A paper describes a structure:
In the P5CSGlu filament, no ligand binds to the [name] domain. Conformational comparison of unliganded, G5P-binding and NADP(H)-released states shows that the overall structures of the [name] domain are similar. The structure of the NADP(H)-release state, which has no bound ligand, is identical to the unliganded state. In our models, unliganded, G5P-binding and NADP(H)-released states represent as open conformation, and the NADP(H)-binding state represents as closed conformation. The interaction formed between F642-P644 of the contact loops in adjacent [name] domains, which appears as a CH/Pi interaction, is critical for the filamentation. In the P5CSGlu filament, the GK and [name] domains are likely in a stable conformational state, while vibration may occur in the [name] domain of P5CSGlu/ATPγS and P5CSMix filaments due to the binding of ligands.
Author numbering:
A (entry chain A), B (entry chain B): 347 to 776
């Protein structure tokens, strides 16, 4: 059925909960060994499914993305080994050690979350990565593919189930049928905790709209912003904008705006940046203030909160820093915002005023990739304002659970009737 | 209006965001000085509103709770001073310091959340506590009273606005009218972040049901459980159960069940515990297994997942530890579960198997009060499975915000084209 999936997943979570030292590490190690030693199967299956899906011709993104090569499998192998090696102290780690009275020691610890539900469009390289993340964060996990990558998905699922059955001995990983009336599966509760979308803009949008009363990690928009201050080296700003837009224009955190200090427009920097974008072939719009600025110029931007993905980038100009800050707050989706300058003052102003999910300074807006932060293998880009924000490592999958080991204590024994005191001496946390 | 409330609150949040060292501490200090020096006003106002609400006779809980005495104001004063003294490093604290390459140092920091919405039934002693929590966690804050405590609420709001206008100079605290079509205000979004209910079971229930697409802290049920193991001192279990149930039977974390090891039923402990509860006057039910156990016994429990609040407590009996664990998982709302014993083995079994919000061992289920954990002044009892679990201090009001201060770096400059490396050396976090 459908619900027995989630129930058995929860049972398997309770199962895996108690093996931490060197067991789940060896489990994900063996998953890597499977992924390197049994590559013929998934390879031929991906060949079959791509050849089949060619004739339907769904979309160039999907039909170009669901490919799979021995190089990508080598990449998955080394990534799984990485998770294995740096995933030794994720479950059971303590966060506090307090003493309240004689022989009563509080300590808050780490636990799984529960039954994660991963939702992605056909992308058969994710599946082992997210399964390794599950097995290293000890929580059970469901999955949900698409219409394509079906046979590849089933092959990889059999692979991960084999790799998991070695130690732990219980299969808490699953998969659901063709779209399984996604609204129905989503409306469920008491079973699943985190809808982790992974597909694309359309998918996360439909999710956040349909999902009611269940926490949904991930974002929906990627409207960056790149404020070029008045005390920034010119070619510096040039290369920053170039490397921000001209590397993965369809990515989730690529600049879809570029504000400029109105003072600096006098130094022909506008001409230079337009020349650069034109050399790179980008259809630029203009902003109402810039629209008013020059003679006839580029077309008028439809909406300032628009998302292009292709090679398009609005350009507006603001008088003062604080106006730029207000602009970013009003329009930007608080995802990823930068600033380039050589002044420390404006740097502190920005980095302490803006409320994005992550703010840079003279860096490039294409660093928010999780892997680059030295943050393991990231499982999403959280923009939600609770529990996770920016790139989420695996620690975006672990809550807390207060435990307490007294001897004989009681509740009102600490009132005037009983002679018990308070210390609150923070012990050395392990 | 209603929305301009939230917008101005957000502006005030951005305002207060940048004063941390000794300023907000002095602000909440001065709030305490107001609460101690201007007590006549709120006192007479509470007198008036209680005298008025007497004639309507709404409910004994409310009409007994909205009282207010100089002793309670002394309590609020010392609590606000406590928050002041231990609230010095809540905003701006760093959590990581990483180095990725030459002169590019990541660091994840602490921030407010946004526009908190506190919802409580008439309880005019909370208002200054939650306003102090706001002003010490730097985030703006709305409020929502009830039909009673109205004049008291307005008096205390004027008081807190005076105290806040000293430093910060912007009023980011508000209040809304009589129930303001709670569904309307709740349906809002893009403005408010945390519905923090504080009233009672009915209130949090109506909230969690009505609230769609907005994070809601707090719980809805308090079904504890007290498993008395087979190697526990008898009078120990006696006093543990007594102090668990017979201190605040209407509280949110008072035992509403008591499982016993079927082996220990042979030692007349059942007779003793029933005698104790009877001496304390508690209408006990029985559990299906206990129902089958004895001759005619106490009545049959209607539903095992019931909530009494008054002096009633089911009693069931389970054969083996693991069966007790499964029982707690199936029925209990994972709020607060204990275990009494003298065996270390079963202790580890329990404390590592059960997935409640907090698990004790030989302690009393009436410790989960926030204040007792050495956890400041608690703002709720989180049972939600994200961002907060168990008693939430003020740290349940602070997310993270990755910042990044490089010199000249770029995105594809770290591919094969540019000679830049990776270090990931975790610097000493401040």
């Amino acid at each position: 059925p459908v619900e027995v999936m989630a129930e058995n997943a929860r049972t398997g979570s309770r199962q895996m909960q108690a093996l931490t030292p060197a067991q789940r590490a060896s489990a994900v190690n063996t998953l890597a060994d499977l992924l390197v030693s049994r590559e013929k199967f998934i390879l031929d299956a991906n060949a079959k499914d791509l050849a089949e899906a060619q004739k339907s011709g769904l979309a160039k993104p999907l039909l170009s993305r669901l490919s799979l090569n021995p190089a990508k499998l080598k990449n998955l192998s080394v990534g799984l080994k990485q998770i294995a090696e740096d995933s030794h102290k994720n479950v059971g780690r303590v966060l506090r050690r307090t003493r309240l009275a004689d022989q009563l020691e509080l300590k808050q610890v780490t636990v799984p979350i529960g039954v994660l539900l991963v939702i992605f469009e056909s992308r058969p390289d994710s599946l082992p990565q997210v399964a390794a993340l599950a097995m290293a964060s000890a929580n059970g996990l469901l999955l949900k593919g698409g219409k394509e990558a079906a046979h590849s998905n089933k092959a990889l699922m059999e692979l991960v189930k084999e790799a998991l059955a070695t130690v732990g001995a219980e299969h808490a990983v699953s998969l659901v049928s063709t779209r399984e009336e996604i609204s129905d599966l989503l409306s469920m509760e008491n079973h699943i905790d985190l809808i982790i979308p992974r597909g694309s803009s359309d998918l996360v949008r439909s999710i956040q709209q349909q999902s009611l009363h269940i926490p949904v990690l991930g974002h929906a928009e990627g409207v960056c912003h790149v404020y070029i201050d008045r005390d920034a080296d010119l070619e510096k700003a040039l290369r920053i904008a170039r490397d921000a837009k001209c590397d993965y224009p369809a990515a989730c955190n690529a600049m879809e705006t570029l504000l400029i200090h109105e003072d600096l427009m006098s130094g022909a920097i506008f001409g230079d940046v337009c020349n650069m974008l034109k050399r790179e072939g980008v259809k630029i719009y203009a902003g109402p203030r810039l629209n008013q600025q020059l003679t006839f110029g580029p077309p008028a931007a439809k909406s300032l909160k628009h998302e292009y993905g292709a090679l398009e980038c609005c350009i507006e100009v603001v008088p003062s820093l604080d106006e730029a800050i207000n602009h970013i707050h009003t329009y930007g989706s608080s995802h990823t915002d930068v600033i380039v300058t050589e002044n420390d003052a404006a740097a502190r102003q920005f980095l302490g005023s803006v409320d994005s999910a992550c703010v840079f300074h003279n860096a490039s807006s294409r660093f928010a990739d999780g892997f680059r932060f030295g943050l393991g293998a990231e499982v999403g880009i959280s923009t939600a304002r609770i529990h996770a924000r920016g790139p989420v490592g695996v620690e975006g999958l672990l809550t807390t659970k207060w435990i307490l080991e007294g001897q004989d204590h009681a509740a009102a024994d600490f009132a005037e009737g009983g002679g018990r005191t308070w210390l609150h001496e923070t012990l050395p946390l392990d």
